[model samples]
Target: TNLVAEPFAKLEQDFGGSIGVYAMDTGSGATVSYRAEERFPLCSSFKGFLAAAVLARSQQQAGLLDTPIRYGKNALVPWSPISEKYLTTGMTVAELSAAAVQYSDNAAANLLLKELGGPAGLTAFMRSIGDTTFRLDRWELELNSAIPGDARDTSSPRAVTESLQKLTLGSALAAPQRQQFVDWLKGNTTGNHRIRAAVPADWAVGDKTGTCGVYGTANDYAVVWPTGRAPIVLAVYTRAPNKDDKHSEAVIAAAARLALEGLG
Candidate 1:
């Protein structure tokens, strides 16, 4: 049987892009009240958080993005999109961050985490932010989580929503840095074909999606239709019943579509 019972029954095909979605239409100024607090394994969804943290640090000091970080034997890893070359290549922190989010590049994230000394600094930063549910640990020898209270890794639903709010309020990054972070969010490339498919093109679906080979876990969050006058966030996450990898995205997407429509 299809996860969605009736009108959406036709949407049950391979469910390839059934990307999980959480959205807020600033144009409407309301959340569709879809299960916004649920938690799921973050997978790659954690990358944006990593970007945010770096952005936050950058704002504290001018030209922080120009900080040159090195990659070395210790930084190099096998089986990551980033490779031994990353060790030999020296790029500004800004370059690596854009690569990390744009490509959903795991190796770059690991490099950053390693540069930050794995979870040592990450934990301190989250704790400083008063977040408890977010947890970070290396996985298969790579970056896993950075969300502050994320039960799935790095941070949690509460923490993500709060950060999104801060970013929206112009508090997360300074005047010059704020638009840069927003552009980065808009540029994150994974969820476009699927999660944003159902949303209108003009809506400006600023989001990130997570898809680890793990079972029954997918997550996404977005700033939909923000106009500066009003901002809203929708955070969506799921714990799959059985690791039905193929169907999870479909289910999450279908559920999200319903949520957004309800808001209208």
Candidate 2:
């Protein structure tokens, strides 16, 4: 059996509804997955694509991320530290990017989106990267919460895995651009209860986590760089009718830890 199939299959059963997982070695291309092609609500995970798109767009804008973004009530989101800390103080593009990735700050994400020309702009960015399947269809926090429907961010495990591959190895951006992305992801503090919860401390993982309690979606995607081996990229997405279940996320961690057992 491949490294991830059995455990992931078991995870699917344990997770109770739907689970998507994809893992690949950056050097070898060998992979394992379950429902990798299926789409799931992405929640804040969409910010990863936004970050990539913004950086790529910044290449043309010149010093785009260095520009300042003043705080405004319209962009303020209730559940974010950035919104709370900088509600009146404001921050710059680079700072907002870091807050978006590291802390999953909704206000930071909204401000960046505003600069990117809103949801349509990010959708255009997704298409530019040849990711027509994944969709970025909403604003962050307060705006999104006000939508009042089944609408939310969405992406397939396959598309997301491929996007990460592009970000890390493919020609999506220059090496330094990719490094900036990697640095932001490595600095992520939001996934402490997900992928990072199971991996060995010595292993370095650059990742993003997305959650929407109302939708019952918990996702964590990462590129794991082991000490002596090539990097491994993995994405785990789970959906359940019960929004409060912690078991689904625990299953993601279990599957991730198991996937790491056979790596170099």
Candidate 3:
């Protein structure tokens, strides 16, 4: 039986939305799952996986990470702070990947998406890593629609956590590239109020967050190290039925706390 299932349902009720969560303890192999298989919009959280995909490609393409990508002002979309700052200097592939992961830079994500052959290519990369539930049907902004019942550009919380475990803690990417991915996630500045909020101050955490800005859609996925214990990987996603609904970070944090406590 799911010990935390009732608490998860109560949390979602209080948030006036649906919450999907999946968490695993690497050492114990124990898990807490609540609506984990349900689909939710990926939002900017896809940037983390996008960074991993770039790292995967870097293994085969020598100097690819250092290759500079110069873009005109047209490439700078809304919410692309990092790319906007580097407009004149032209950030390299690695820098763009970092921006995408750390800053959730929309322009950087689009530029990298183009490099990976658009949305389908990233989906292919996730499949290559044994994640069958992930799908990126559209690009940024458009993919953030979070329309009720629409499946495009959506993935399950379970798949997100599983794939994240593979890329960050498993052998999905080479050792150096894996470390790079972990470093980028560790440096993420956008997730402070999400999963990181629930993790203890001393524990090590690397997380990626997604805020769709519609339908109360948002999410956070993380790999957390608790003192001497093995790492914990988890994902929390939420969405509401109405288009104008708002997301709550506190709800996500509460869910994460419950998942962690349940695992313990």
Candidate 4:
């Protein structure tokens, strides 16, 4: 077994429901994963990919990031940080990307999705990076309203984790653009209850979290910089039997802690 696998294998059974984790050290392509290829609703975790798509597209066309996107009544969604606060003001591509990735703002995410030419563009971007299995099916608002198990953005834990590793290594977003995207991820304060909860304060960790009410979906994926060592990519996806089980998040935190332990 690999370093991460030897340790994480024991911890995998600690969850109350379905759980999957894929963790890799960037220095080496080594990984310790469970259900790494299994698919699950990616949720807002897909926002990171969206940001990458926007940046990649911007490099080919000038003023793409600076373009202003208006917020209309139709943009309002129950889980929006922009629309729920009644901030009808227009947002630029940069601003929308931040809100979408950092705050998991549904409205902002949809606007950026539209700006990127819908799911088709997003899919194209991922496929450009050699990932063909993941799918982003609908807009944020539609996803929020649809049934929990219904079609929504989906991806394998390995693909999502590997993509983040690529982003960190400048394969997805080049130098300046990669740093900008990482800065936004570092500032993300949402879903701190999971991966961030188990990490130490001194160590730097950037992550995105996605939850589906009580519908039993809780996911968090991140790039963690452990002190004095190379960074690691960690992704945890939980499909709970019920919406109320806080154990799913607990599973994520525990898995992260154990994964770190394995890396050492």
Poorest stretch of ten by lDDT in candidate 3: 1-10
Clashes of each: 15, 0, 0, 1
**TM-scores of all models?**
0.74, 0.89, 0.98, 0.88
lDDT of each: 0.58, 0.77, 0.95, 0.76
Best-matching candidate per TM-score: 3
Q: For model 2, what is the error of residue 211's alpha carbon versus the real structure, in angstroms, after optimal superposition? A: 0.8
- lDDT score at residue 176, model 2, on the 0-100 scale: 74
Residues 213-254 of candidate 2 have per-residue lDDT tens digits of 553567889988878888888888877655554435677787
Per-residue CA lDDT of candidate 4, range 42-151, in tens?
86788888988888887888887888876677777767866456465677788778888888988888777887789888988888888887678787645532234555
- Ranking under TM-score, best-scoring first? 3, 2, 4, 1
Q: Judged by lDDT, which candidate is best?
A: 3
When 1 and 2 are scored with lDDT, the better candidate is: 2
Model 3 lDDT tens row, 79-150: 899999999999999999999999999999999999999999999999999999999999977999999999
- Give a tens-digit lDDT track for model 1, residues 1-264: 433333333333334322233455555655444333445466776666667667777877788789777766665455445444456767678777776666666667776665555655555555555555555665423443223234536345546655665564446567666676667777877776445665666677667777655444566766666334355566666543344443255565556577566554
Superposing all C-alpha atoms, what RMSD in Å does each candidate have to the true structure? 5.2, 3.0, 0.9, 2.8
lDDT of 4: 0.76
Off by over 4 Å in 4: 1-14, 83-86, 144-152, 241-247
Q: What is the lDDT of residue 256 in candidate 3?
A: 96
